[PDB]
Amino acid sequence: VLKTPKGTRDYSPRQMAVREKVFDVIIRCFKRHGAEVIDTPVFELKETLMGKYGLIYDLKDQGGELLSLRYDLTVPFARYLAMNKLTNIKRYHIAKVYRRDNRYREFYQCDFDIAGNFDPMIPDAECLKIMCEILSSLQIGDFLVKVNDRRILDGMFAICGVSDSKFRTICSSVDKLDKVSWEEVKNEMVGEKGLAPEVADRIGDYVQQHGGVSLVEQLLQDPKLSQNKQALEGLGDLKLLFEYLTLFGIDDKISFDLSLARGLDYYTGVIYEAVLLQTPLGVGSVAAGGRYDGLVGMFDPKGRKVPCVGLSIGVERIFSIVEQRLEALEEKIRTTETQVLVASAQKKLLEERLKLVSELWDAGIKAELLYKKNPKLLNQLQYCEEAGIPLVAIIGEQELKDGVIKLRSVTSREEVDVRREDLVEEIKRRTGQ
Amino acid sequence: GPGSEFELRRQFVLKTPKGTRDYSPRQMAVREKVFDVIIRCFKRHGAEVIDTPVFELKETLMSKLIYDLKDQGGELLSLRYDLTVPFARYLAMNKLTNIKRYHIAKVYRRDNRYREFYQCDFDIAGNFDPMIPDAECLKIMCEILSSLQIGDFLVKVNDRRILDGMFAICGVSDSKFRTICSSVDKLDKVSWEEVKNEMVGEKGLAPEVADRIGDYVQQHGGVSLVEQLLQDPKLSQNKQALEGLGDLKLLFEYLTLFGIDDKISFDLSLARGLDYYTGVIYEAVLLQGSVAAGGRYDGLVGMFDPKGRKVPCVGLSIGVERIFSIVEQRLEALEEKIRTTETQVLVASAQKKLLEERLKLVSELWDAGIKAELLYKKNPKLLNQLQYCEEAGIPLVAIIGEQELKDGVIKLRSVTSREEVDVRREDLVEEIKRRTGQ
Ligand SMILES: [Cl-]
């Protein structure tokens, strides 16, 4: 019966160590952009989640409110904003979400969002900048951020002749163009979904193109698209976006891709998705986001609109990559931060070690000793070697009388005598405070 | 007007579940400060960390206080009510016989922010020499309680074996152990007479028997009290009491070496968590609340292992929810504005048409690891930018103007002092670093 629920896994000490290094990079970035932080309960009223999703963990009806586990951090955010009658906020939220999909049922989401009425595209641009800072800093190899706008999509599908009835499914097909070829995608829309091959080929004339600001300029000249009001504003915003990206120094990491069509329940403005590269060959997505201006309005009692743009870093995939990067380097990932083991080779010294280890703790030094009265020096050394503990402070009967400690570097094997009074400052010096 | 039914219905559902609440940025600043103290202590003691799913199999957690997940055609799941039972499952499942770990995570209880709340656990599992890990747990509690600077505190200590032997030697029947413990436990809230009456009148104990319990249970003291009970005519003939007292005497030797023997109060009325604890039991009290508990529980892991293999465990739980409030009140009483962001500088301008230049600059600052912001406006008024800083606690404003750009210069104004000085652009990163301490 010993088992974690399907789709969940524990984080082992080593996995926690990597998670800490990855979160530390991400949080340091969020904080650099003046983000506040909040937290919200792991479950919300079922009502709060109902009427938002077209796969949600519900809690047993036990005689109170009907409750559900958060499927994401964005809805809780909207509920939070509305509940506190906030009109603007810049926040990050790092927490687990829950989905009965098919470690994929419980996993971390890492969100940053900017809510408020501001001038066009400036916050949207900062979101892309934040993506890029983070992905670069993690050093998970090269990447590329795909960008599109919801209104460009709507307009493109309007003038190509896609019905409102098939709009939703056709986007699902187009959105596959990242992994698969246009030939497959075309054949699906036509063969499986009953889309006219005339419409399919027209969509193709747009959907197959990608590039930088150059493509935004071309489509602003497109005779058919120009005459669609929505596509035109969307393109105007992207043109603006590219200007700001250039100033942020990251226009070379951005690809305007008209096949990007996801999260169409939420997104009203830009849509983006970061993808890892090979060698530009897409190897998988590691972040996503966009502008969703209708969500908060759905919660505010007076339906007051609060624009929002934001991003989700896909940390689960990043945990794997970083873990494997570390493994391939023979770099032993430490699961503890102990700086020194207090040891002795002789017997009858437990009380002396207890006294020393405690002095070290008092000075704020990270120390341990074996829970054994007369451990063998070899066993203590082996313990340090496996744990990556860099120093061993060896206490002996004579050395105590002399007021010295034998300090041995575990890896270099070099041993030096240190005055007891100098021991605390000497350990700090060897580790870096 | 009061508002349409449309409006009032929406307001009616704009809430967090009962007995839960969001953490605002202000409360997150407090919680981050508390957790930093605690985690720095855990790490200082060589602890590893693990994490477990918020829900375990229902069969694993066996109550009218445990959240169950709806049967949606699959496993029957429940939300965890603590971290110790997930730990035991974790040790048994991974066939570990020793681990020293801490775990900080929310737990869930349908009791009467009190249904979802943080537990901060530290545990040392494994077969070791007597009472050293136990001593270290008390040290850890003492380090943390001290560093949190939440006033003076005390740690009550007792042992299950001492209660066992003590009940035996003064007449209690073995089968009435638990309920008499439940009564004795309330002597930190209630008088001995109220307690006695509940044991005799309610619990069917004999008057003579309860009186002998009162002779011991009413007592609390230091290491000298341990020595006295080792001299006790009746107790010192009971094997359990003898072991229990022997171990406390030893614990005290180690607490003296750790310089915390003066914070420990041996208290015979401490009888908590007897579903778990097989050795030491303890509870920290703030002096003017239950702010940290723990003890040794050697049978729990054994109950999850198929071959019933025992793994000795001793640990502690820090009541982090009571501390959050105390610390927040400390901060608010100082009227010290709690910042919710770390921004060092706002990039600003008074003139129009400089958005592009603020974008370039703020991005330069970000690339240098400086915490910077700018208002999301094409042409903000300087006043609005300065007010934003004043309200948020941002100490510097970097003002870009057309002339400054030509001179390769940036006007850097202190938000508090209002003094503005010119700064060569290439020096800006360093000049900011200096003024904010980095
Ligand atoms: Cl001023």
The CATH code of the domain that includes B40 is 3.30.930.10
Instruction: Compute, in degrees rounded to 10, the torsion defined by CA atoms A294, A299, A304, A306.
Output: -50
Exposure pattern of B392-411 as b/e (b: 16+ CB <10 Å)? bebbbbbbbbeebeeeebbb
* Token code pair at residue B436: 């904010």
Contact B282, B295 (CB under 8 A): yes
Count Cα neighbours of B215 within 13 Å in the Cβ-side half-sphere. 15
Which chain A residues have a beta carbon less than 8 Å from that of B369? Answer: 32
A380: Cβ contacts below 8 Å, ≥ 6 apart: A341, A343, A370, A392
- For residues A285 and A391, membership in a common domain is answered with no
* Token code pair at residue B22: 């969001």
Using CB atoms, which residue from A10, A11, A361 is nearest to B139?
A361
Instruction: Compute, in degrees rounded to 10, the torsion defined by CA atoms B171, B173, B179, B180.
Output: 10
* Token code pair at residue B181: 């413990």
A83 touches chain B (CB under 8 A): yes
Instruction: Show the 3-state SS of chain B.
Output: CCCCHHHHHHHHHCCCCCCCCCECHHHHHHHHHHHHHHHHHHHHCCCEECECCCEEEHHHHCCCCCCEECCCCCCCEEECCCCHHHHHHHHHHCCCCCEEEEEEEEEECCCCCCCEEEEEEEEEECCCCCCHHHHHHHHHHHHHHHHCCCCCEEEEEEEHHHHHHHHHHCCCCHHHHHHHHHHHHHHHCCCHHHHHHHHHHHCCCCHHHHHHHHHHHCCEECHHHHHHHHCCCCHHHCHHHHHHHHHHHHHHHHHHHCCCHHHEEEECCCCCCCCCCCCEEEEEEECCCEEEEEEECCCHHHHHCCCCCCCCEEEEEECHHHHHHHHHHHHHHCCCCCCCCCCCEEEECCCCCCHHHHHHHHHHHHHCCCCEECCCCCCCCHHHHHHHHHHHCCCEEEECCHHHHHCCEEEEEECCCCCEEEEEHHHHHHHHHHHHCC
- Chain CA centroid to CA B113, Å: 14
- For residues A243 and A342, membership in a common domain is answered with no
Last residue of a domain, one of B300, B319, B338: B338
CA–CA distance from B357 to each of A132, B117, B429 (Å)?
20, 46, 16
Last residue of a domain, one of A310, A333, A356: A333
* Token code pair at residue A333: 């990932």
Contact A431, A418 (CB under 8 A): no
Supply the DSSP string of A6-70, one letter for each residue.
Answer: TT--PBPHHHHHHHHHHHHHHHHHHHHTT-EE-B--SEEEHHHHTTS-----BBP--SS--EEE-
d(CA A280, CA A123): 28
Contact A156, A204 (CB under 8 A): no
Residue B424's DSSP bridge partners are B409
- For residues A304 and A348, membership in a common domain is answered with no
First to last CA, chain B: 55
Question: Which residue in this structure is represented by tokens 């305007």?
Answer: A256
Residue B263's DSSP bridge partners are none
- For residues B219 and B344, membership in a common domain is answered with no
H helices of A90-210, in order, are: 122-138, 150-160, 164-174, 182-191, 197-207
How far off is chain A from B392, nearest CA to CA, in Å? 10
A92 touches chain B (CB under 8 A): no
Contact A322, A22 (CB under 8 A): yes
Ligand 1 midpoint to CA B416 (Å) = 8
* 3-state SS assignment for residue A342: strand
Question: Which residue in this structure is represented by tokens 């747990």?
Answer: B137
Question: Which residue in this structure is represented by tokens 């270099």?
Answer: A412
- For residues B272 and B416, membership in a common domain is answered with no
**Parallel, antiparallel or unpaired: strands B264-267 and B153-159:** parallel
Phi, psi of A115 (to 5 degrees): -105, 135
CA–CA distance from B257 to each of A2, A346, A353, A359 (Å)?
41, 19, 9, 9
d(CA B305, CA A1): 10
A378: Cβ contacts below 8 Å, ≥ 6 apart: none
Ligand 1 midpoint to CA B367 (Å) = 28
B56 touches chain A (CB under 8 A): yes
* Token code pair at residue A347: 């017997």
Instruction: Compute, in degrees rounded to 10, the torsion defined by CA atoms B333, B336, B342, B344.
Output: 180
Instruction: Quote helix, strand, coil % in chain A, to nearest 5.
Output: 45, 20, 35
Phi, psi of B240 (to 5 degrees): -65, -50
- For residues A85 and A133, membership in a common domain is answered with yes
d(CA A31, CA A57): 32
- For residues B218 and B137, membership in a common domain is answered with yes
* Token code pair at residue A289: 């986001």
Method: X-ray
* Token code pair at residue A263: 């999260």
Q: What Rg do the C-alpha atoms of chain B give, in angstroms?
A: 29
* Token code pair at residue A278: 């090979």
Is residue B358 marked as binding?
Answer: no
* Token code pair at residue A424: 């605390």
| DSSP 8-class letter at A5 | P
* Residue A356, burial from CB neighbour count under 10 angstroms (0-12, 13-18, 19+): buried
Residue A431, H or E segment: helix A423-431
CA angle A210, A152, A236 (to 5 degrees): 90
Residue A155's DSSP bridge partners are none
Contact assignment for A122 to B21 by CB distance below 8 Å: no
* Residue A247, burial from CB neighbour count under 10 angstroms (0-12, 13-18, 19+): buried
Question: Which residue in this structure is represented by tokens 């307690």?
Answer: B195
Short-list B146, B102, B132, CA closest to A357: B132
* Token code pair at residue A336: 């503890």
A361 touches chain B (CB under 8 A): yes
Tally the domains of chain A: 2
Count Cα neighbours of A99 within 13 Å in the Cβ-side half-sphere. 13
**Experimental structure resolution, Å:** 2.4
Residue B315's DSSP bridge partners are B123, B295
Breaks (C-N over 2.5 A) in chain B follow: 62, 112, 288
Where residue B346 sits, what CATH number does that domain have?
Answer: 3.40.50.800
Breaks (C-N over 2.5 A) in chain A follow: 54, 102, 279
- For residues B182 and B313, membership in a common domain is answered with yes
Contact A75, A103 (CB under 8 A): no
How far off is chain B from A173, nearest CA to CA, in Å? 30
* Token code pair at residue B43: 């790490």
* Token code pair at residue A377: 């020096």
**Parallel, antiparallel or unpaired: strands B290-296 and A308-313:** unpaired
- Chain CA centroid to CA B429, Å: 38
Report the 10 Å Cβ neighbour count for B337.
11
Owning domain of residue B389 = 339-438
* Token code pair at residue B174: 């073995």
- For residues A275 and A417, membership in a common domain is answered with no
d(CA B229, CA B401): 81
Contact B284, B76 (CB under 8 A): no
Residue B425: what residue type?
R
**Parallel, antiparallel or unpaired: strands B280-286 and B264-267:** unpaired
Count Cα neighbours of A336 within 13 Å in the Cβ-side half-sphere. 26
Which chain B residues have a beta carbon less than 8 Å from that of A119? Answer: 376-378
Using CB atoms, which residue from B43, B52, B392 is nearest to A366?
B43
Phi, psi of B157 (to 5 degrees): -135, 140
Residues composing chain A = 433
- Chain CA centroid to CA A163, Å: 36
A320 touches chain B (CB under 8 A): no
Is residue A109 marked as binding?
Answer: yes
d(CA A145, CA A270): 12
* Token code pair at residue B346: 């706002």
Contact assignment for B128 to A372 by CB distance below 8 Å: yes
Ligand 1 ion: nearby residues, β-carbon < 5 Å: B 418
Contact B396, B344 (CB under 8 A): yes
Using CB atoms, which residue from A38, A64, A335 is nearest to B28?
A38
* Token code pair at residue B4: 């349409």
**Parallel, antiparallel or unpaired: strands A270-278 and A43-45:** unpaired
Which chain B residues have a beta carbon less than 8 Å from that of A3? Answer: 57, 60, 93
CA angle A19, A81, A50 (to 5 degrees): 85
Which chain A residues have a beta carbon less than 8 Å from that of B355? Answer: 122
d(CA B66, CA B60): 12
Using CB atoms, which residue from B15, B44, B71 is nearest to A361?
B44
Q: What is the sign of the dihedral through the CA atoms of A326, A331, A332 and A335?
A: negative
- For residues B90 and B187, membership in a common domain is answered with yes
Last residue of a domain, one of B320, B338, B356: B338
* Token code pair at residue A356: 């020393």
* Residue B65, burial from CB neighbour count under 10 angstroms (0-12, 13-18, 19+): exposed
Short-list A300, A287, A361, CA closest to A108: A287
Using CB atoms, which residue from B20, B67, B373 is nearest to A34?
B373
Short-list B165, B257, B253, CA closest to B216: B165
Short-list A305, A293, A312, A265, CA closest to A82: A305
Helix B177-184 with B207-217: angle, nearest 10 deg = 50
CA–CA distance from B47 to each of A333, B133, B312 (Å)?
15, 12, 17
* 3-state SS assignment for residue A209: coil
Q: What is the sign of the dihedral through the CA atoms of B112, B116, B122 and B127?
A: positive
B336: Cβ contacts below 8 Å, ≥ 6 apart: none
A33 touches chain B (CB under 8 A): yes
Q: What is the sign of the dihedral through the CA atoms of B290, B294, B300 and B304?
A: positive
CA–CA distance from A172 to each of A50, A148, A168, B145 (Å)?
23, 15, 7, 55
* Token code pair at residue B347: 């990039």
d(CA B274, CA A411): 45
- For residues B162 and B281, membership in a common domain is answered with yes
- For residues B329 and B349, membership in a common domain is answered with no
How far off is chain B from A263, nearest CA to CA, in Å? 24
Instruction: Compute, in degrees rounded to 10, the torsion defined by CA atoms B168, B174, B180, B185.
Output: 70
A15: Cβ contacts below 8 Å, ≥ 6 apart: A319, A323
